[PDB]
């Protein structure tokens, strides 16, 4: 297995911004808000890698919308590009205002994978995304999402995000226990994984070839539910426990009407292009994959460039609860993906909002930068250990 020390080293960071600078910026924010109608008092300061949260306590009689509806001018008067107003902090009584820095301390991916969370993560398909607003890494299980929407306009750090997710897959699991399927309509980025041993098909450039791939995925989900009903265990983890215990206790169980089945991960670079070229049947197949495949071990990474009702329909939203929103156009597309506002106030360059599975406030996550050096190194490191193991029934 390729060790995590293949990645690029850490950086002599631009650490220790002085408390006199923090006090000057806090008094500057108090004065610039006092110049408008509102009155404020900076309570605490939380300096972070990319932005800097100013937990402010508004004065008596000041609503939150009187802080929300002037964020353009609050960002303009502070000589920054865009400021973000967290309207509620869970637990305290303070409105959160998050201001970008001058020198962006860039998040590095080896600093994310060296966490206590990732190296002790029991699952076989984790996702390292990056640090949060305070510098702590966020690694959440992709087998618990159990699907993923990714959107944001161009140049907002999205192909790097999908590559960070795929490297988060590739640093932990052997091809026996996890296994990828790559659909790449714009054959520019995901052709870099050409011939890795964690695949099933050639990296799909065509479109009807991708339709055959999705029909194979539906058939695989159906035969795995029939096989788990034959064995008599609900989900994939208990089935792998049963096929472990059969191989331990003397005699394995033969193939019923066996091995450790892999956790299939079906990624899509741009499903906007798929529902451009192929049509409604791709929408129906993605709907009936994401309807049922949580217990079967088949997952989706849907990425797109158009957070619109044309691309993201209601059927896609119904089965996929977990969203990733990078910098988008405006509040219309933010309410199209996250079903709420806030995604327009980002910075790009991999500055996402991680909506957790379920209902909650979105956690702002700065996406870890990855480079072609590391990606080519990991691809060649897996091509040394394994071979192309294609089963071409997926595309027939």
Residues near its own copies (CB under 8 A): 35-37, 60-61, 63-64, 70, 72-73, 76-79, 81, 87-88, 90-93, 95, 153-156, 185-188, 191, 205, 225, 234, 272-273, 276-277, 287-288, 291-292, 294-295, 305-306, 308, 310, 314-315, 317-319, 321, 327, 329, 339-340, 348, 357-360
E strand or H helix at 149, and its extent? strand 147-151
The binder of 250, among ligand ADP, its own copies, none, by C-beta within 5 to 8 A per type, is none
Between CA 160 and CA 291 the distance in angstroms is: 28
C-alpha closest to that of 322 among 284, 289, 354: 354
C-alpha closest to that of 148 among 7, 288, 380, 324: 324
Report the nearest approach of its own copies to the CB of residue 325 (Å).
14
* By the rule CB under 6 A, 157 interacts with ligand ADP: yes
Between CA 264 and CA 266 the distance in angstroms is: 6
Window contacting ligand ADP (CB under 6 A); options: 151-159, 231-239, 251-259, 381-389: 151-159
The binder of 105, among ligand ADP, its own copies, none, by C-beta within 5 to 8 A per type, is none
Known binding-site residues equal: 155-160, 349, 367-368
x/- track of binding to ligand ADP for residues 273-312 (CB under 6 A): --------------------------------x-------
The binder of 106, among its own copies, ligand ADP, none, by C-beta within 5 to 8 A per type, is ligand ADP
* By the rule CB under 6 A, 155 interacts with ligand ADP: yes
Distances (CA, A) of 388 to 168, 187, 201, 309, 316: 20, 19, 9, 38, 32
* By the rule CB under 6 A, 49 interacts with ligand ADP: no
At a CB cut-off of 8 Å and minimum separation 6, what does 107 contact? 49, 50, 130, 131, 350, 366, 367, 368, 369
Scan residues 343-382 and list those touching ligand ADP (CB under 6 A).
349-350, 367-369
Known binding-site residues for ATP equal: 155-160, 349, 367-368
- First-residue to last-residue Cα distance in the chain: 32
Residue 7, classed as helix, strand or coil, is coil
The binder of 306, among its own copies, ligand ADP, none, by C-beta within 5 to 8 A per type, is its own copies
């Amino acid at each position: 297995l390729p060790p995590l020390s293949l990645l690029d080293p850490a950086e002599v960071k631009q650490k220790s911004y002085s408390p006199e600078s923090l006090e000057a910026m806090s008094r500057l924010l108090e004065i610039k808000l006092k110049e408008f109608g509102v009155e404020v008092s900076v309570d605490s300061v939380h300096p972070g890698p990319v932005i800097t949260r100013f937990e402010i306590q508004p004065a008596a009689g000041v609503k939150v919308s009187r802080i929300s509806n002037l964020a353009k001018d609050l960002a303009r008067s502070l000589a920054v590009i865009s400021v973000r107003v967290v309207e509620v902090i869970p637990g305290k009584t303070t409105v959160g205002i998050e201001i970008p820095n001058e020198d962006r301390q860039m998040v590095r991916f080896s600093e994310v994978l060296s966490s206590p969370e990732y190296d002790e993560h029991k699952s076989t398909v984790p996702l390292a995304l990056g640090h949060d607003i305070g510098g702590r890494p966020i690694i959440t299980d992709l087998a618990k999402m159990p699907h993923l929407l990714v959107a944001g306009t161009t140049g907002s750090g999205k192909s790097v995000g999908v590559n960070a997710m795929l490297l988060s897959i590739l640093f932990k699991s052997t091809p026996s226990e996890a296994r990828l399927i790559m659909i790449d309509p714009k054959m520019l980025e995901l052709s870099i994984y050409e011939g890795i041993p964690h695949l099933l098909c050639p990296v799909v450039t065509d479109m009807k070839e991708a339709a055959n791939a999705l029909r194979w995925s539906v058939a695989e989900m159906e035969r795995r539910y029939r096989l788990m009903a034959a064995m008599g265990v609900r989900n994939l983890a208990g089935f792998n426990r049963k096929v472990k215990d059969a191989e331990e206790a003397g005699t394995p169980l033969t193939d019923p009407l066996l091995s450790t089945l892999p956790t299939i991960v079906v990624v899509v670079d741009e499903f906007a292009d798929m529902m451009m070229i192929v049509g409604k049947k791709v929408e129906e197949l993605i709907a009936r994959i994401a309807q049922k495949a949580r217990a079967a071990g088949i997952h989706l990474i849907l990425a797109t460039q158009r957070p619109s009702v044309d691309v993201i329909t209601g059927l896609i939203k119904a089965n996929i609860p977990t969203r990733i929103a990078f910098q988008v156009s405006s509040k219309i597309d933010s309410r199209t993906i996250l079903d709420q506002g806030g995604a327009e106030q980002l910075l790009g360059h991999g500055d996402m909002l991680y909506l957790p599975p379920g209902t909650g406030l979105p956690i702002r996550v700065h996406g870890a930068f990855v480079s072609d050096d590391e990606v080519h190194r990991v691809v060649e490191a897996w091509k040394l250990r394994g071979a192309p193991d294609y089963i071409e029934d997926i595309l027939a």
